[PDB]
Amino acid sequence: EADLTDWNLPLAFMKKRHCEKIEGSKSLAQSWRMKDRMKTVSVALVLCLNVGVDPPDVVKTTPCARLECWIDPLSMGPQKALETIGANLQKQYENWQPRARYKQSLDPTVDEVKKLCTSLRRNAKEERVLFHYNGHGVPRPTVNGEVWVFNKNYTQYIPLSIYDLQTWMGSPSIFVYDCSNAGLIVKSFKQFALQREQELEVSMKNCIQLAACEATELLPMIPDLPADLFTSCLTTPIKIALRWFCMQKCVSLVPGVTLDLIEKIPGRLNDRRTPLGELNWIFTAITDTIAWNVLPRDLFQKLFRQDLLVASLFRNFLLAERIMRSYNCTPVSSPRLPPTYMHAMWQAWDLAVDICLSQLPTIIEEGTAFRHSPFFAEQLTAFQVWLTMGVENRNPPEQLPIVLQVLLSQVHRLRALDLLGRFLDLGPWAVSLALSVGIFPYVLKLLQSSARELRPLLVFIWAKILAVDSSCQADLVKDNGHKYFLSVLADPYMPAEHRTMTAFILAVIVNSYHTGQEACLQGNLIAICLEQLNDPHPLLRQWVAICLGRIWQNFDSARWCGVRDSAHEKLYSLLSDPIPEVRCAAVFALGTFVGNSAERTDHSTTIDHNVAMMLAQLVSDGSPMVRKELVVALSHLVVQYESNFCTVALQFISVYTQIWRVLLHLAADPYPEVSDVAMKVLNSIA
């Protein structure tokens, strides 16, 4: 047949440079940065327990819920118990925010609270202060916007106005109420907030509030649970999460799991390789995932990313919402969250816990080696399955925030970095997502690693990020990540595909940014680049030359270094390169080399004339793309020697004579774009 003749023929002038326009893609409004990093500087633990005597409101049951910060208060005698609960409560918070001034108030007066709160605002001037209120020993908050504390003698419950309480506490602050009609406090807090705004004409958005209950509701009295149920959820989630798991109907599925085995669970909450730290890690992934999928992006970055303590409180609040729901309680938050209790991801938690503490009989008693959870493996598998047919802007993958959590260990880091690259590849829309979920500071921290297996994966990820957001050149020079890439660009065994990405990364880090130019110059870029300039890869030859060109762009120090290494000489080889991208990249660099002379004597001037005449033999060139850069390059030469070209220009109405004659040929170009740009530069002499 006559089909083999058709398929086997070169289609001339049908490539990217011809079809697409020679123009840069317009950068989108990148809004992924945390435009604020708030910090919770100090904490106020107001505990109104009055250990022993119950308030008149609530009649307690004979067995009853008694545990308060995992302490039976009635075991220890009244006074010691109150100090102990205060001590434990501090410790619990120090898991989440270990570097903050804690200051307890234990069965306080009103004056006592005033002096406490006013002092903490003075210290934490404009940074955030936490106010924790635990009103289990005092009557329920009133309709009139009041919260109860004691008198000096502990003979009368004194009311304290929420108005006065939000006077003493400042603007950026967070309030945690663990008492019975706690919704009333949140209502009345917002009322007095509106009331202050009306008085100000002739602290709302700043103030976050978490509350154990809706205004009508009462806290549960159930003997299995703590009294401190909300505080417990916020501040020790894994402990109640496991105790709650053992109270549900789903325990039938794991026989030999009582509450007593949960007490004796091995591990710590830091060590992710232990059993307890496994769960703690999984839990952090699950809650941070539920939040990201359920909340609008704005409100997510406000609560789950700005500051650690708030983010920890809201992560753990989602668990409170789930647990307390099962006892006719609805927790309340000030920036109101939509209901997460029925999110699918909770079924993943249930299974994760189940599998983890089905092992406890054998881990404790037999002394069996703790097998790790399949959680993170399977979640990466889901993320992978999404990518297969996930080429589109459809629903984004649920697992992005889990992929982030996996980077933190080493166990699944290689696989995640692979998948994350595969995801980032899909398009710049994806790189935007991955920056919004908060991948940036972890991907940047891995540049401190020496594990050589990461090098091809991180190089890939960073090329994708910097292709979208070029402002990250600021961050990479600060942390000395610019050294990480320099090493990869001077490594013969690293593939030429990845060395090309690396050369691009350096050409972005260096681009019009003296801090990055001075840093890469000292990391010996010019010597490294020249070693790879004659590679058998036309993309690498291209980028290495752009990279070389950018480093001495308006930077005389990198030019002098180029003269010693004799870079301009080694770049003349690229002027007769087959690929017209490379020829252009070479012309770019030799032009950028010429432009930053700063009026120096015979050494610099004699070099510019050698670079002039070498460019001046790319007039009769096939690509107009090369010829445009050839004009732009000779533009830099004209700007530098403007006094000399005025002599040549005024005459016809011998080096400069030659370069002006070149621009006349480029002015009378067949191609319109080259004739235009040549005409502009030629008229700015005229």
């Binding site: 830091n270 990313r305 650690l308 983010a311 982030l404 933190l408 972890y442 921290k445 891995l446 690693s449």
Partner: peptide, 8 residues
């Protein structure tokens, strides 16, 4: 000073 603990 990062949010989650990374062990590089």
């Amino acid at each position: 000073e990062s949010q989650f603990e990374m062990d590089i």
